[PDB]
Amino acid sequence: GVPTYLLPGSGQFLTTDDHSSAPVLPCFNPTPEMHIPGQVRNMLEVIQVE
Amino acid sequence: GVPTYLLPGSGQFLTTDDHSSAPVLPCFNPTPEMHIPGQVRNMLEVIQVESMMEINNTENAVGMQRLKVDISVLTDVDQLLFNIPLDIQLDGPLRNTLVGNISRYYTHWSGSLEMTFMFCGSFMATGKLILCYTPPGGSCPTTRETAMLGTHIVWDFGLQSSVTLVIPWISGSHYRMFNNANVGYVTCFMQTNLIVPSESSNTCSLIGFVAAKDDFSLRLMRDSPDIGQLEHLHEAEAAYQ
Amino acid sequence: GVPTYLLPGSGQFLTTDDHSSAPVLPCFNPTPEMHIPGQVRNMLEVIQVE
Amino acid sequence: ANYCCAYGEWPTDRFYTLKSVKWETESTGWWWKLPDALNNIGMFGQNVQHHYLYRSGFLIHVQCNATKFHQGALLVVAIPEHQRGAHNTTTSPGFDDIMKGEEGGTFNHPYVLDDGTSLACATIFPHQWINLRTNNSATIVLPWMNAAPMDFPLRHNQWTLAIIPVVPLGTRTVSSMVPITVSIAPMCCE
Amino acid sequence: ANYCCAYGEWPTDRFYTLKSVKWETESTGWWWKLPDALNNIGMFGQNVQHHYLYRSGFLIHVQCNATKFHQGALLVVAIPEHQRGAHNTTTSPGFDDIMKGEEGGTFNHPYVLDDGTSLACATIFPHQWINLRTNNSATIVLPWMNAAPMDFPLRHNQWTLAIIPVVPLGTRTVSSMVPITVSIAPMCCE
Amino acid sequence: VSETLVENFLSRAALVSKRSFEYKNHTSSEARTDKNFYKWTINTKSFVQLRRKLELFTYLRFDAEITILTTVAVGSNNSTYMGLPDLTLQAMFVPTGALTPEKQDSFHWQSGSNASVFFKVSDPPARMTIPFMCINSAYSVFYDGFAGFEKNGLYGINPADTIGNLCVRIVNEHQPIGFTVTVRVYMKPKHIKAWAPRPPRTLPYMSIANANYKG
Amino acid sequence: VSETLVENFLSRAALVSKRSFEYKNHTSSEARTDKNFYKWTINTKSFVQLRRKLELFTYLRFDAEITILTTVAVGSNNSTYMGLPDLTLQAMFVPTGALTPEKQDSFHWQSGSNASVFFKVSDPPARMTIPFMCINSAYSVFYDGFAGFEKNGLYGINPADTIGNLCVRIVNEHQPIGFTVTVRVYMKPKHIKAWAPRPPRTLPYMSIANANYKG
Predict the structure, then answer these.
(1) Which of D5, D7, D124 would best serve as a mutation to test chain B binding (most B beta carbons within 10 A)?
(2) G194 in Cβ contact with G57 (< 8 Å)
(3) Based on the number of CB atoms within 10 Å of its own CB, is G182 exposed (0-12), middle (13-18) or buried (19 or more)?
(4) Where's the Picornavirus capsid domain (chains D, E) (predicted)?
(5) Shortest CA distance to G42 belongs to which of G132, G104, G156, G108?
(6) Quick one: which of E115, E37, E118 has its CA closest to E81?
């Protein structure tokens, strides 16, 4: 066994953290994505349109 | 000591996760496995085996009579023999088959089907049948010449006892699965009369099979509703007091 | 800190698991073992005696 | 002649020929449990009741004798571990109605295979089709088919050969009869 | 002549010319849903109701016929998945008021695009400007624009071509009229 | 420039649904479908903030991460404080094309095919990641089409998408003392891809199913 | 194509057994074999869903992972809520050929050979993996044979297989207040190998030991 101790702030919900979570359907294969024209990757490209 | 903190969702039972658990008997050695013929590794191999269709869709037909349609000498030409809607999840000829039974365990199905029809008349029986395929975006044909306009096969069972029809690739998920079944039909018409020798029987029967091609796909496994629903069984409580 | 979550079956006593435990007397040195004739390493050797 | 190796596995030559059965227009089907069928005949039966042990495959040949004016289709299917069931009761089938010997039994409900499954899906098992207008014989080669490496022939039937007329026999006369001959040849019998 | 490839994607030649609309000083705008507009005309419509399936792009040409004494500005914008909305009720728009066919419809509130969004920001969509003092024609090339690889032409309109006069038509006379001609050429129609 | 990416712009946890329900000895038919459980179809067009943020694009493709926060309290004070007994809750994700429970003791709660999570009140909030559940390559935020093949279909409702239905119940058989439990559901889209940006909404929304505008 | 593998098709946790039992000061002979404990022979042919799914094959070889979920509640409300005292439960896996307990205080509970797990109610559910326990190379879903050598043997019952028996009791000596505890057992087969696929069942089951059909 690995000896561990709990740091302050354990068991808290931050609503901003990015932690991997358990997949609800591990065996399900999502539909493959196709090329859809007009992809937005950054919102700065939106405001550059007059 | 390693400093750790507990993430949200710790100590929860997911019923779907795959985590290694503690062996109950670590020292026990299970019986070594031998080679048993007939191993199944993927369930797609099951649906690729042809199974008989309940072609005789008449309501009064029960049991064995549902597996064959009878062609008699008195049957008129240009008469519809059977129609097979192409929706495995739908209750019809494809329902009580391997493909339908396995597909009802999943939500989204896609692929192409293959149908085989076998004529089981006498050796000298002769005649011609028209097997027409109707695409999902169309109406089921009602007359022989209307059926002849579309994709069709003129089957002479006096020469060939078996004919194979390949249904093109179809995605049942997109084609109206509770979008709130006209997914395609296969119909047979009597092109000519049935001619038999005087010593043979006046009635002949047809047997149909259905199988899934290697391009079939199943996704989003669910609970099959055709089990007969959960009723408590006999000797259940007494088995594990 | 290492983000961790507790799996089902944590804090349970199995009576069959093999986990290292804390030595009660870490500084104590046990008596060295000598060669004693008649060592048994497997119980199959016992049943092979008539 | 065009044999069928069950599950694509190929594991003597006595070919014990059972008494021929009569295929009528109203026949439902016939079945034989393979270890039990030969348990009382020939060197196979003598060795079976001499020893407590048995291990071998099987070779099945089914032949029909009919003219070109006869019609009908047979499903010759070998069902592994065909655990039968009763029709309208909760009690298990008995020894008398399970072990029929070389005489064999008949299907009460061929539609459900006397099991509660479907006959339409029985083609998943090793099988051959006998369509009287094209062929009159079927040959199936059966592998060991047992979880254990060893078996007791007097208590467990590993295979069940079933012959079921899917399309009833027919001719001009309302009454028809066509003999069906079954020959079983155990291979490497123990 | 100076075409506009929508979203920088370049995916026959019949150029179905719809009946010209009359641009008046009080016109609010016109719109056509592209799959629906050609659903009842030409080989495109015949194939569309022959098959259950359709997949193709589009080519749009809009032209105005005006003299040098006319003034006005048009916004020729192709809106993908232009889901319209009602004005003073909670009920969804109906089939009759959504599928207008080749006749098309008119904007009730061009300021909000009949959607509740803003016309001022409609330039984010593929668009061209028709300023009568500089040009009188606009050409837009439209890609596939569908989430699925396949689509039903009779139930889903992928594109909506909208022509909205931002600056009203004007001349010395209080009444003005300038014809507007719309030509749609589906490419690789299925 | 990283803060203004689409992933950072849209991947913020939000209270998509909050619904309390009583559970006191509901042997009788009081509050059908609310006896000891609640259900919520997973739709993103519920809160106006998320509606306006998501409706800036035509097509979206994301995985929804759901965290469930549950609190228990009582205002009756029929006895001493006595603390709050630890209750175990079951949250089952019922995807489209599957049967959802209609009562707290329905056999659908033990389906074995629908993914389910069992958690206690004293435990940290339960988290699950629902994958991209759509027959198409992307969700349709706006759908210029009709669902059904008949003309009676609804405008704007894609029969695709339809992420699924989420049901939460109290596993414990009804204890002698009733209680009010409030379940808060937070959804945070992940691995977001967006296409075809659209003008922002300017008029107040009139319905959750229509693009109707007031004015 | 991975979702439709046999391992994914069959390896889904399912509520194989659920059985509550009271424990209130059972010094008397009330509810023999149900005083403070329950036993359950580990058989997979208990729920019709799992029956139909497993009976698609003739031979199976898998390891069963068991998770036990326990909840405690009371409807008497003889006093204040006062919470629920933390009880320790013992789950002992008794394999075939071993003696199973007949009472809560039987000496079999401290055998030292049967594997046992001690867990608390407030703890997460206990998990244990039962290995492939069969004298043969695979379980026999269908057995065309008789168990005993005498003709009185039962048809379809393989004297092999017989994974074992699972017994659960409350370790704590009976506290002054009685309680109702419900134990839910979830079994998830792992490392599954299947042979000789069979036609699906079409008629409703008539018994847990027979292949009898109605009709």
Answers:
(1) D124
(2) yes
(3) middle
(4) 1-169
(5) G132
(6) E115
